[PDB]
Amino acid sequence: MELWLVRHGETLWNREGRLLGWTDLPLTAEGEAQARRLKGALPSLPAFSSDLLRARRTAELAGFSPRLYPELREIHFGALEGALWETMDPRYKEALLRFQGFHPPGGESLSAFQERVFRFLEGLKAPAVLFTHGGVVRAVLRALGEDGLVPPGSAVAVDWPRRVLVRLALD
């Protein structure tokens, strides 16, 4: 199934290097600019989006009117929300890097996050554009045997659940 996953544009915590999960931050000026550049670069297919502001705004600026789905939310970092990546506990950084055995207090476990994301994707019966987050795109890429690191305001098209089709980044 052809699915286009879009990482929302940047927020202040991107440059600041703080873990951004369910904290509802707005896009930055550049973040909106990235969103606008996506217009005309994404196929006109039914659209879905995380209900968080930065994702919704990205969708709008990109010219879409997406179905809202909390299932497309970034992982809930719980007590780690807002934590500086640079100062995070080695055990936590390791779990995140290896993408496994990660369950922050007051948050969501990576396994529950994956289950939520993949269950949602499984329900899509036709091609669509999905406005979402870095961790969601990385869970998908990693499940497809690839590096799940993509720039804010960039997109990846995949043939779920078989392979990555193309990675799209703009300047």
Residue by residue, DSSP assigns 69-89 as: -GGGSPP--GGGTT-BGGGS-
CB atoms within 10 A of CB 90: 7
Give one DSSP letter per residue of 6-46, joined into a string.
Answer: EEPPPBHHHHHTB--SS--PPB-HHHHHHHHHHTTTS----
Task: Give the active site residue among 8, 32, 76, 108.
Answer: 8
CA–CA distance, 46 with 48 (Å, rounded to integer): 7
Please indicate if the annotation marks 13 as binding a ligand: yes
Coil/strand/helix, residue 153: coil
Please indicate if the annotation marks 57 as binding a ligand: no
Please indicate if the annotation marks 135 as binding a ligand: no
CB 78, CB 96: distance < 8 Å: no
Q: How was this structure determined?
A: X-ray
DSSP letter assigned to residue 146: S
CA–CA distance, 139 with 150 (Å, rounded to integer): 12
Is 8 an annotated catalytic residue?
Answer: yes
Q: Which amino acid is at 64?
A: F
CA–CA distance, 135 with 68 (Å, rounded to integer): 18
CB 95, CB 40: distance < 8 Å: no
Please indicate if the annotation marks 60 as binding a ligand: no
Enter the resolution in angstroms: 1.9
Domains for the chain: give ranges and CATH numbers.
Answer: 1-171 (3.40.50.1240)
CB 48, CB 72: distance < 8 Å: yes
Give one DSSP letter per residue of 85-117, joined into a string.
Answer: GGGS-HHHHHHHHTT-S---TTS--HHHHHHHH
Coil/strand/helix, residue 63: coil
Please indicate if the annotation marks 28 as binding a ligand: no
Task: Give the active site residue among 32, 74, 76, 133.
Answer: 74
